[PDB]
Amino acid sequence: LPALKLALEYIVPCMNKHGICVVDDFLGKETGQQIGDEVRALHDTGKFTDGQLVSQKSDSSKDIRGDKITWIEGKEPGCETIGLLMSSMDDLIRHCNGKLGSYKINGRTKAMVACYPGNGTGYVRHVDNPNGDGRCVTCIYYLNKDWDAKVSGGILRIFPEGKAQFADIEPKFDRLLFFWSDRRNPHEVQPAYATRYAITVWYFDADERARAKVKYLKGVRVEL
Template sequence: MDDASGEPRRLRKRPFAWASDSSGHSEERSSSSSEQEQADDTCDRWEDQQTVEIHTQVSEAVEYFQLREQSMNDHGAPTKMGAGPRGERVVVRRQERLQALRGRRPLMLREIAKQLRGRGFVRLVDFLGPSVGSNLLEGFAQLSWQPGRLGDAQSSDQSRSLRGDEIAWPSLSEAGRFGEALQRWMQALDELVADLRLHLNRPDELLRVERREPPMASCYPQHARYIRHYDNNCDEGLGDCNGRRLTAVYYLNKGMSHSDGGHLRILGQRGIYDLLPDFDTLTLFWADRRTPHEVMPNLSERKRLALSCWYVDVTEAPDAPAFPMRLESQSTGRGVTCEVTKTHDLASQQRQREDVKQKI
């Protein structure tokens, strides 16, 4: 893929360059912001030589399949990083930094952009407040659910053991409190992404992201998991390119603790992070090959509930079933009403998408 400057295609950033100590744990080093930026620059440096490119791609593939094997053999093993003090401390520190910038939106946006660019994900707590979250939660009871499916697999016992969630597509035109809450959520998310476009304006970031898929609700019963995968398995225009650039997942699980499992495990460029899917928390991460991730088994009897949306670069996938997002940034916004999409027939398009979604 050529970049905006018209430079020739070069090697994609290595997706698996996280630092790991000999125990297999990864740790974020505390670093000054200039060191941090230097590290980011290093990540952005490209290799030019063809041989290096081929070698790197082969070892990435091998590494990825080893990771997948590891994921499939985990069988609900307790999480290593998030449950332990180190990984959690890092995630919490980042969150606190963001919290401190609340009410100062321009600074908050810069911090969100920095975290996304630097480690591939960002976690925002107290995204909408308890009443919107509770109305969403209430509405989940009225959705019609169906099994989530892996790319090529039928809904067999084996595929359910790899991906055990149930999914549904709530309509933004739902009546009552649920519909209102959905629209509030969608609007807040669209505004956030629109604002972030100003900070994340590279071609492989949000530059060409103007659309999003219909939101998807997910429900993981006890023991359900989702093995390691990418949400968009596109490699420089090759492979299964669905245009997804940014994944947003908003969680609805009250009173969760690490012993409940169900973490979102992100294999980021700087480490492995287990993120607790707790109530009113939003996680954003790159949907493409920069972010292998998985949902760890839900060890609790309570269902793990979330609402997701994928933001799409249609230049990568012109036929993607995606719709215009609200593009006005909140800072300059004039209160344009959130576009309401009937998800009726979108559900069948979405199902087709789920069928072809490449799972590793």
């Protein structure tokens, strides 16, 4: 699918109606596989953090750690297919510009690459952007060949505002997900029993981010 077609015929109407959108087979398998090798390579060469402290036991031999991360700009040695994905995410968003809510997306973060190490850790119920920091859309790409959740866990459970029900999304190979970052979409990752990779970028709305600047707040100091 051409990027603009996916945008106009799927991502735009779906986001505006449901605020959660799944595109399967986004880059195809040669390119997915390649991103996979790049992410595994970052892992094996120790580029990730050790993982979120889950259980801080008193003896610390026995501390339990969870999701590991690394931030990627997209041009680093070893990361060029990741840079490629990011560029591809950007192209898709830019083809939706204007058309997702009344937002005007002018910015994103670096890619946050996450590895749930498969030791039964997950990620607690949260909202990505609760306090108005400018992030309007979360975009995650999943890396996980032949993932079977019945076996390996690691479902993303989203809990849309004012719904009795949730939405389970499997972290399937070459799947791209978008959802609104704010309190509309509380979500969690259920415990993962196999190594589970995902790559997230967040997109900024211009107005929200411009006044987050003010609210939050050397520099951005000047003078006297």
